Amino acid sequence: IYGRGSLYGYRFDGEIHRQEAQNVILYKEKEAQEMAVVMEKLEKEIQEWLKTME
Amino acid sequence: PLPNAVVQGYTSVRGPKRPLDHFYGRTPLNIDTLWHWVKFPHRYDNLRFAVCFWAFLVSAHFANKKQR
Ligand SMILES: CCCCCCCCCCCCO[C@@H]1O[C@H](CO)[C@@H](O[C@H]2O[C@H](CO)[C@@H](O)[C@H](O)[C@H]2O)[C@H](O)[C@H]1O
Ligand SMILES: COCCOCCOCCOc1ccc(C(C)(C)CC(C)(C)C)cc1
Ligand SMILES: COCCOCCOCCOc1ccc(C(C)(C)CC(C)(C)C)cc1
Numbered sequence: 001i002y003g004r005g006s007l008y009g010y011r012f013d014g015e016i017h018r019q020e021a022q023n024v025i026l027y028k029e030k031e032a033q034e035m036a037v038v039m040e041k042l043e044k045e046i047q048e049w050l051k052t053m054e
Numbered sequence: 055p056l057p058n059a060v061v062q063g064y065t066s067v068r069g070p071k072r073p074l075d076h077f078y079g080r081t082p083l084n085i086d087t088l089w090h091w092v093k094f095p096h097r098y099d100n101l102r103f104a105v106c107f108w109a110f111l112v113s114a115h116f117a118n119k120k121q122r
């Protein structure tokens with residue numbers, strides 16, 4: 001009770017707080033999915049600019 | 055209210071009751087004769103104080119770490 005700081009029970013436990021890990025997994029999946037597309041686009045653009053000028 | 059037979063415990067004749075056995079040479083063993091063998095705890099009181107302190111402290115440590 002003294003270490004928790006609460007007299008009833010722990011805090012930041014529960015499915016509302018555990019689901020944030022799965023939300024982070026999905027968010028990172030989406031972020032990597034978009035970042036691969038953006039990086040491929042920018043790499044194509046750079047390879048175009050270089051093979052046109054250099 | 056109730057008859058004398060019910061009060062005295064017998065209708066006509068008072069029956070003899072076998073007395074209680076004593077077991078000479080040793081203490082009586084009854085539900086009320088147990089403090090002879092089991093007194094209040096007196097041997098590990100200071101250890102009790104120390105262990106209560108350490109239990110509180112270790113529990114508080116791990117609870118705070120879990121919460122954080
Ligand atoms: C008072 C208002 C009107 C209501 C009257 C009736 C009230 C009845 C409720 C009280 C009952 C008490 O019941 C009581 O039980 C005990 C058992 O412990 C009986 O006890 C009897 O038997 C025991 C052993 O068995 C004997 O050792 C004892 O000498 C004898 O009295 C009492 O004889 C009886 O009186
Ligand atoms: C469910 O709980 C289990 C309860 O078990 C009761 C254990 O009973 C065993 C008791 O054994 C003894 C035998 C002798 C003694 C002596 C005679 C040595 C005690 C003495 C010197 C204090 C009178 C103490 C305990
Ligand atoms: C709080 O109490 C809970 C448990 O209580 C246990 C009480 O135990 C007392 C046991 O009584 C005895 C004591 C001694 C003995 C022996 C056999 C050791 C006595 C002997 C050697 C004199 C015959 C037997 C029973």
